[PDB]
Design a protein around this ligand. Structure first.
Ligand SMILES: [Cl-]
Ligand SMILES: [Cl-]
Lengths: 330, 325
């Protein structure tokens, strides 16, 4: 039988976002933790009205974050692991970036973006110089990037760099992990100055500050230097049109040493542009927030590297992690 | 088995799905595809948008399940062909005029404040104009329930329809009962949608209106049937009880009240759409709720009614209570 349920669930999907934002901001999951709490008790613990807590928690049960037992609400394993502040795997503060109005405003008029072919946000959306949303990204999103940074590092350890450039270093964890596994590596991070403050702090925390160097400014304007064994591009290229990525890849080529390598870490959808769903859905994010950005397929990236003068590019799917890697060879 | 933050991240970004379906309806994408197959280039030309914008939106709409992507272009699912193509008799797309009204989405923009307060941080203002939008935009999905309730009651009647809105509940009683006289109660501006619908359905000579607040106007007397579609949920129990006392007075000796509303099981988590409606009440009203049958039963009892009885109606989304004077 045919049904308008998808339509209506989709129309009202914004409510789920608001519900999880409230839950996180109010520490609801931390208050429940691995036990069972009534809404009356969560009201006391989180300092809210009881009826408000009850209506929120019933909804959180309805959409899958918790269960409702006789004696109260209980987290699912996933909420206990990822949303309870007591857990080492807590990612709940990612909303500081993901639900930043600096990001969500692009979706306030997606019709406008579809009409014009890119972000309806004033200027160049999130690509304006030193946009503060990238400080929020660097602070808020680093927990989920820790593991892939380590994976890329141990994929690099099969190569041995002495000189590393990390372009849009952000939190700095990709270059920092290279430094962690390679005692003779010197790391150069390129980002806006206020973002590199985070990267530096993370290098400090990780014990590699003395081998961590910064080149503040636009990846397109700064002088990188040269003789780089390894150039990392984590979650950068998707923001720009193809010509701009090509401009960047030529600059990178000049800076590489003889046997130099570029590692791209990004959302790389299959050629269908609909799978994997999370990778492929990122193209709407690029429409909403950037003028000409896209979630580019491997074939598209292979062609950019080919046109920028590289000899060979190769996909490493990395099934253990959400995003995908391309290694290019000078 | 293996734990995942996927539910968390997909819930966090869920607002994006609402944005995409809003753009698609506003741009008339589903009407442009219809029951055929159209490339993103063709659709950009038909809808007067950029090619890349259309491609990116359509790929996203394929991902979340509204259409498929074939070799030669995009193709609707049956559900989209049925409900989102304007050419279909069952088109419901313009429901977003109410559902994505700022007058509802603003409430969720400060849901955290609502939870702390116990009620809306910002609909029940005298003559709020979002109710003219509800009446125009939400009527297509109420057409079938209205016919079912008219089926359920139908055996010279005097009917009161309280918060008549689009007027379809009362109108359907008159559609099926040619000697029924209908008295719609809502704000004057909302009643003009009701009257337009009365006329369209050919029942206008037997459609009458009492303009103003359901809580202040004078209903008259000797009502066989009183309809309460989608209204009690906005108010607290005491305010509901007040209205039901006022209703009781207006009823003839063997008079019945029919409530059509979101009535969740006593778990307050099923059925999912009924149960989740209480968050919408938190976000948008000071003291509204999705009340359960026990709660409505108690309200009618305290208001002096002899009896109330549930009719789930599984052939629809919402549930029905009949109360007896
Ligand atoms: Cl990153
Ligand atoms: Cl209604």
């Amino acid at each position: 039988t045919p049904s308008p349920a998808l339509f209506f669930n989709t129309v009202n999907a914004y409510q789920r976002s608001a519900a999880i934002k409230a839950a996180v901001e109010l520490n609801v999951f931390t208050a429940i933790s691995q036990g069972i709490e009534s809404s009356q008790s969560l009201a006391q613990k989180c300092q809210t009205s009881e009826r408000g807590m009850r209506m929120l928690c019933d909804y959180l049960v309805i959409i899958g974050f918790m269960t409702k037992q006789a004696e109260g609400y209980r987290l699912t394993s996933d909420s206990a692991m990822f949303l309870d502040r007591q857990s080492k795997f807590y990612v709940g503060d990612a909303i500081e970036f993901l639900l930043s109005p600096m990001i969500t405003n692009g979706f306030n008029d997606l019709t406008a973006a579809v009409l014009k072919g890119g972000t309806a946000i004033s200027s160049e959306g999130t690509l304006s110089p030193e946009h503060p949303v990238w400080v929020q990204f660097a602070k808020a999103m680093s927990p989920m990037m820790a593991n892939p940074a380590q994976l890329i590092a141990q994929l690099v350890n099969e190569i041995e760099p002495l000189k590393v450039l990390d372009i849009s270093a952000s939190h700095g964890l990709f270059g920092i992990a290279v430094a962690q596994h390679n005692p003779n590596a010197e790391i150069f991070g390129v980002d806006w100055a206020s973002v590199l403050e985070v990267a530096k702090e993370n290098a400090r925390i990780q014990g590699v500050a003395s081998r961590y160097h910064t080149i503040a400014g636009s990846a397109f304007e700064v002088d990188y230097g040269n003789d780089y064994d390894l150039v990392l591009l984590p979650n950068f290229l998707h923001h720009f049109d193809v010509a701009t990525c090509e401009q960047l890849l030529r600059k990178i080529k000049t800076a590489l040493a003889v046997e130099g390598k570029v590692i791209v870490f990004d959302f790389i959808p299959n050629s269908d542009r609909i799978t994997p769903p999370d990778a492929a859905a990122f193209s709407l994010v690029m429409l909403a927030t950037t003028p000409n950005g896209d979630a580019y397929t491997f074939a598209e990236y292979e062609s950019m590297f080919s046109n920028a003068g590289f000899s060979h590019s190769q996909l490493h799917s990395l099934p253990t992690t959400q995003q995908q890697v391309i290694v290019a060879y000078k």
